[PDB]
Enzyme design. Sequence first.
Site, short mmCIF file in Angstrom:
data_model
loop_
_atom_site.label_atom_id
_atom_site.label_comp_id
_atom_site.label_asym_id
_atom_site.label_seq_id
_atom_site.Cartn_x
_atom_site.Cartn_y
_atom_site.Cartn_z
CB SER A 1 -6.34 4.43 -11.74
OG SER A 1 -7.17 5.48 -11.24
CD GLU B 1 -6.76 7.07 -19.56
OE1 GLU B 1 -7.43 6.88 -18.53
OE2 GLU B 1 -5.75 6.38 -19.85
CG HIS C 1 -9.41 5.22 -15.99
ND1 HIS C 1 -8.20 5.76 -16.36
CD2 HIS C 1 -9.35 5.04 -14.65
CE1 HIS C 1 -7.43 5.88 -15.29
NE2 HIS C 1 -8.11 5.45 -14.24
C1 LIG Z 1 -9.65 0.96 -10.34
O1 LIG Z 1 -9.98 2.26 -10.77
C2 LIG Z 1 -10.84 2.40 -11.84
C3 LIG Z 1 -11.07 1.37 -12.75
C4 LIG Z 1 -11.93 1.55 -13.83
C5 LIG Z 1 -12.55 2.77 -14.01
C6 LIG Z 1 -12.31 3.80 -13.11
C7 LIG Z 1 -11.46 3.66 -12.02
N1 LIG Z 1 -11.23 4.73 -11.11
C8 LIG Z 1 -12.03 4.99 -10.02
S1 LIG Z 1 -11.75 6.27 -8.98
N2 LIG Z 1 -13.13 4.16 -9.80
C9 LIG Z 1 -14.08 4.34 -8.66
C10 LIG Z 1 -15.36 5.14 -9.09
N3 LIG Z 1 -15.04 6.60 -9.18
C11 LIG Z 1 -15.02 7.08 -10.61
C12 LIG Z 1 -16.03 7.45 -8.42
#
Ligand SMILES: COc1ccccc1NC(=S)NCCN(C)C
Lengths: 536, 534
Positions: free
Chosen positions: A203, A328, A441
């Site tokens: 990410s 994703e 994701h």
């Molecule tokens: C570590 O990153 C991730 C891991 C798993 C799924 C999404 C994310 N990515 C983000 S940004 N997570 C924070 C919440 N946001 C969507 C508002």
Amino acid sequence: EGREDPQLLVRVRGGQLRGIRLKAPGGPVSAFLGIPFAEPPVGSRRFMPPEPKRPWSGVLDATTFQNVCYQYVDTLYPGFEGTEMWNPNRELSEDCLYLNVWTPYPRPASPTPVLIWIYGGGFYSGAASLDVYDGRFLAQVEGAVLVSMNYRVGTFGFLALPGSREAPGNVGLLDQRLALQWVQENIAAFGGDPMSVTLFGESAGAASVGMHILSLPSRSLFHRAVLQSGTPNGPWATVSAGEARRRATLLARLVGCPNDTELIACLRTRPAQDLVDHEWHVLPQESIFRFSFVPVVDGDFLSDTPEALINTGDFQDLQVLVGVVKDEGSYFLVYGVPGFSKDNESLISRAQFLAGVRIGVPQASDLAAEAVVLHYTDWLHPEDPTHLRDAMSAVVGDHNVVCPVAQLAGRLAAQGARVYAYIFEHRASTLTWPLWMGVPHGYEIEFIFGLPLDPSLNYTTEERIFAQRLMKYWTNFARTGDPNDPRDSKSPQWPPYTTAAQQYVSLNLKPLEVRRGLRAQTCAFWNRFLPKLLSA
Amino acid sequence: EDPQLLVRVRGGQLRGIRLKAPGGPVSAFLGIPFAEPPVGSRRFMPPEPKRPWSGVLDATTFQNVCYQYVDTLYPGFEGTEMWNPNRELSEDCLYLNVWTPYPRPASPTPVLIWIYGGGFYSGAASLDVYDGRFLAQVEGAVLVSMNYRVGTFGFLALPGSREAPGNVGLLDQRLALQWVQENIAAFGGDPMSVTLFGESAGAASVGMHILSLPSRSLFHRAVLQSGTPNGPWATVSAGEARRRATLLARLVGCPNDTELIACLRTRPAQDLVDHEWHVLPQESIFRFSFVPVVDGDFLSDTPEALINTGDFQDLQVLVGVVKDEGSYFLVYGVPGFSKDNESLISRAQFLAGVRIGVPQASDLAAEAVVLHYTDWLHPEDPTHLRDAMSAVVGDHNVVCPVAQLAGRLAAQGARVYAYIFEHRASTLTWPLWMGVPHGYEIEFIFGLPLDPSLNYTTEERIFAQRLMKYWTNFARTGDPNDPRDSKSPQWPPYTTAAQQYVSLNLKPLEVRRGLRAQTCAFWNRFLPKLLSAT
Ligand SMILES: COc1ccccc1NC(=S)NCCN(C)C
Ligand SMILES: COc1ccccc1NC(=S)NCCN(C)C
């Protein structure tokens, strides 16, 4: 010094460390946790580039994780494992610039290739101490030296008034770079080979890896790179200097801070939590997969936009591994798109799909948004709720990850780099998110780090074997720049990604399958047509 | 003298001719005048009914072909010559033909009226592929075909003027339709069951009769083969028709509307044909200089507007396309395409070709087309690029207009049946890369394979009989399905919901869903916005 092994006593440039002997399923490993690599970026040093850690006296205890960098805590689904696993697991503090080292036990007597993990979290969250980033399995099973660092996120790491001295921007990336320099000087004391350093991240961490590829002062600090579901190019990983300036100026107003010096000086007097409480109020449009404070195109760390740098860069002596998960976009829908929840099937109407597109593609004009809707609609079933739900997920995933990755892989391959590409298609038997989200994701990470080898986590036997395969792919690439095992020709081979054949592999419980074209048709829409449309 | 060949129509007595079909004789009445010759001061004017005649008028031979351009791309080549005039050219050309079963039908018989195509600038009812012989003999049908004025003579218009109001070629068709209502019963035809069918510009003509109220009382069902009144080539605005007529006048030395048309009427026919093609606004293919005009009279509004708001409740329609609509037109202007080689093209030629196939497209719309039709796994494969060039032209000009029409008709009350014709004639003389080209389903609908001297395969003979049955069953009932056969399977109506159509080939009917749905969303929903915004 007395009764301490002493396979756990090590000296680094800053002083002596005492690590801890950890238990991994197959044997012990050495862990050196909470090593400071920078002066605490607090007080007058908020928003400033990091300063190297000044030496300490005595033996520093490196047996536990240190603080997590101050950040917004997720409370969408309070107490839900699927979200809590990403939340901070140590105290929040601006005093957070520490790194961690896992090595075999006893430490290797021969320079060992090093893996450096850069966590993601939209550049506003994350920590190297999360369970899914536990380096003990890669250290024990593959004999790797694994390093992970904390870096400042949110305003603390990326609030920028470009051109100013007191908030130049990108300091979170400079935190990462300083950790990379720390590895170059000190990792030999742990048995690691500083001449064989591979970065990998997911990410925003993958986007961070890409920014180090594109920043000259970082290139001397590593030799290979893995970008998991993230890129420096794309719509969310960077902002312009003008946009960064307006976001920083608005935030300042929102916390009561109305010349750059006086503004930043006033921001430095504000409590950390006050900045976190307002950081989400500066985005220009209602959106998902957008983050307020991200790397800025300052003309310094980034001499130009990532797009321009990958379109014209020379990447001859560079080996890269890139890929995506099957779904994703699904994770991000429940964070702002009406009609989407983890607690129901999230079947949506056509109207909700159009509204969702404006949120998933917030920068799109009405015509660009219409183009998206027409492309992703199934005109045999234009109102089917299940297809619209899956189309909404594909829009967000394709726009933010899959097609930026496809673009990056194509440019890097065309310009000298050796590229390997994958799609990760296995849904963990332990996943707590609903089935309609598919393989979301971030849920390949637990397999790369080898958590299924922990017998108490109730993974399946096939998932255990699967994790060992991926660990071998990743460490083989770290060792040689080639994920294929040097002498295991029985298993099918992983061909490099090239502009001509566009070959990638599927990672699942079956043996490797070679496929061609990373959503070639759809990514022509996102990467070739839609830029022309928006600029008109 | 044979009494089966003597017929009294409102104009006088006719004498037909007994023709031999493979299975038996038929009665043919060829070259019947339905209008006064549109010559001299009647050039560009609406047609007038034919005056009565004395004695027995000889109706045993085809009459002249309406004056028109003659193709010279491939001189002597069967593939192009089969469409060229096979009788002398003349402005005195408003005649129609009638085929019936020998002896005459004992009871009133459904009538099939053919309207030939040819881009509104060419064509004739006397072509061998329009031979009504077989449909009359095998299916017992009464078949009618008329000549109508083409090119400048049929569609040159100075909108608003009295002496060149436009659409007179369509008025020629309508007058022939009126003739059928008044006279076809004398041949054993049923004027209360008339089915129009046509191909290319003929299909567009059929559609305009659907969209023109005065025509609706003259027929009951319609077939549109590879053509529609909507689309980018079948109509022009009043302003564009005026521009093209004035430019042609300038090119031939002429000189207010009256004075202009008066000088045009003094010019020999070939002088007008010589400059017919020089008035198009862009280099293009599948574009024709003089076509029906949105005059607010015959066409009260654009075909697009009329199909969007019309009431088509008591209407049955059969529509379809061939597999490779665009291939034929590429060899007539797109560099890199020839009947004599495999026409493998570069990517640069593909971009150039798209500007010619979509002449009205802006640079950005042209780019949208290129990116949509490129196969980004093989973006430079010349075979794919060649086939993609054909798909662009065919989808833009035929397939998606047809899908548009079929959807609007079904949505607004009409009974619609749709097909795709996928059989390549064993006797085809064009190269293989052209596939199933525009216009090469006709010989099968008309039943030419039933003639053994033409050396069709025995499977093609059986195939032709099937198609003749579909078309005549539709003419009889508004439903192409055989009411005696049982689930071969059934040909379902096209609907906006299911979007079902059938494949017409040597294998049994196969039902499919969606007529290039994704691609026609591009052409019919997105591209108008992209241009309606520049
Ligand atoms: C570590 O990153 C991730 C891991 C798993 C799924 C999404 C994310 N990515 C983000 S940004 N997570 C924070 C919440 N946001 C969507 C508002
Ligand atoms: C009768 O109609 C056709 C039959 C077969 C193939 C094409 C057409 N259509 C036209 S317009 N033929 C004239 C030549 N054109 C390529 C400019």
